[PDB]
Amino acid sequence: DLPAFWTVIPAAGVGSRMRADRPKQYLDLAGRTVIERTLDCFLEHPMLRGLVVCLAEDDPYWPGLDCAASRHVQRAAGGAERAGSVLNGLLRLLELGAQADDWVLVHDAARPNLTRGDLDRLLEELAEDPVGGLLAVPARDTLKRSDRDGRVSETIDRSVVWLAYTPQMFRLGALHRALADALVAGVAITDEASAMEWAGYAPKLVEGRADNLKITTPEDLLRLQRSFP
Amino acid sequence: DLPAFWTVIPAAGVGSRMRADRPKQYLDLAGRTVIERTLDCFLEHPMLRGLVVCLAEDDPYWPGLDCAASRHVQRAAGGAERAGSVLNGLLRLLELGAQADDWVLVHDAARPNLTRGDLDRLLEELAEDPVGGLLAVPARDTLKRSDRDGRVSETIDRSVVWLAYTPQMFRLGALHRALADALVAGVAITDEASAMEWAGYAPKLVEGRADNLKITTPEDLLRLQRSFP
Ligand SMILES: COC(=O)C[C@H]1c2cccnc2C(=O)N1C
Ligand SMILES: COC(=O)C[C@H]1c2cccnc2C(=O)N1C
């Protein structure tokens, strides 16, 4: 009994001009764009109520993709920052019949290697949580704290340190209020969990796979080019 | 005026039996083993006084490599843990004429992408430092601290968090005493910097390139397979 959920993929900030240095979400990953493979991670899930991609209105790459003509993929307008784009995605879900108590998953457009196991694991562990949570991976590299002169002040106990991944799973109404209030407050919002944390909540960490990586350099594609199929 | 230095490559812990799942230092990286490309990062440096690789006495892969028959590559016996193997490397340097005040660089055998720029940068910034230091990279992923129930207690300020890389550069005599004393003390030694930290010193962080990665999975090879030449 996995819970029903909506999905928001923030994918705005793309200029109106096509560039040789393409946005990472439109790079080729074994014959398909990154973002097309990212949507593949959700679109077939039986509990998906609907998916919204947040895009710049003048995105020049999106209208060429198959998913741009799919009724299973809704569209929302990008914001001034990622939080505002996520916010617009929430508003789009509200037009599509979403309820304040419905679960929403926000996921990076450049994380195309999300396995069904991780997705279902996140869904089952948080289904009856009062706030929600996020996929995350234990820190494996040795972590040093820097003093003001650039010298090691301490080696951080990485046994309690987790790298924050996506999807991040929260209730629609609460995430809507956290994001909206944190924006007007001037909070430096990174991910959705950072907004819930500012609003006073403690998101649950759900352990995922480390190879659910975000494509931040074209070099990161090379790690994934043998991961499909 | 870059300082003269010795190099220690800890590369022991290899069983006597060849295995299909080879040690990472013996995997192929564009036609050469990882460790052969790692040695390439130091062997031609004009200020290198000598290089010691720490190896299991019964290492079945090493005698097949070109560098196993190179007079420019010295050999030391592996220890019970990495620290002990590094320690044995220091003892080998002392037999080769090394002085207590000589700089020593310890580097991971599975970091074959160390560029000459990083190496020279480390050498010039620490040449007149009282203790030494290490290459390191700023943390770029969002970092969450976990409470005892697996919920986020805080988002760590990653502006002060650095991932510890190699080489790590310290004086021979001091590193010898730190490692020896920390072993008998029972300290959980990770890298050489962790031993200097326990001995009371604050290593200087020197910023390096992020793609000086350690090969921990065969997937990590894919990121580097286009990096040579
Ligand atoms: C430089 O591009 C980004 O940072 C992308 C980011 C962004 C910026 C501004 C508005 N919306 C967004 C959005 O959805 N993102 C995923
Ligand atoms: C599982 O292999 C390792 O952890 C490798 C490690 C090690 C272990 C035991 C003794 N010496 C060493 C050494 O030099 N290392 C680099």
Numbering used by the authors:
A (entry chain A), B (entry chain A): 5 to 233
Provide the authors' own sentences about this structure as they appear in the paper.
Next, we embarked on a screening campaign of a library containing 192 fragments obtained from Edelris (Lyon, France). In total, we collected crystals for 51 fragments, from which we obtained a handful of co‐crystal structures. Among these, we identified three fragments, which were in complex with the protein. The initial fragment occupies the CTP binding cavity within the active site. Since all residues involved in CTP binding are conserved between both homologues, we assumed that the cavity had the same function in PaIspD. Within this cavity, the main interaction between 1 and the protein seems to be a hydrogen bond formed between the pyridyl nitrogen atom and the side chain hydroxyl group of Ser 89 (distance=2.6 Å). Interestingly, this hydroxyl group undergoes a similar interaction with one of the nitrogen atoms of the cytosine of CTP. The rest of the atoms of 1 do not seem to undergo any other obvious interactions, with the acetate tail of 1 being mostly solvent‐exposed. Based on that, we hypothesized that a similar binding mode could be obtained by truncating this part of the fragment.
The 2‐C‐methylerythritol‐D‐erythritol‐4‐phosphate (MEP) pathway represents an attractive source of drug targets due to its essential role in numerous pathogenic Gram‐negative bacteria and Mycobacterium tuberculosis (Mt), whilst being absent in human cells. In the present work, we set our focus on the third enzyme in the MEP pathway, namely IspD, catalyzing the formation of 4‐diphosphocytidyl‐2‐C‐methylerythritol (CDP‐ME) from MEP and CTP in the presence of Mg2+. Here, we solved the first crystal structure of Pseudomonas aeruginosa (Pa) IspD, the third enzyme in the MEP pathway and present the discovery of a fragment‐based compound class identified through crystallographic screening of PaIspD.
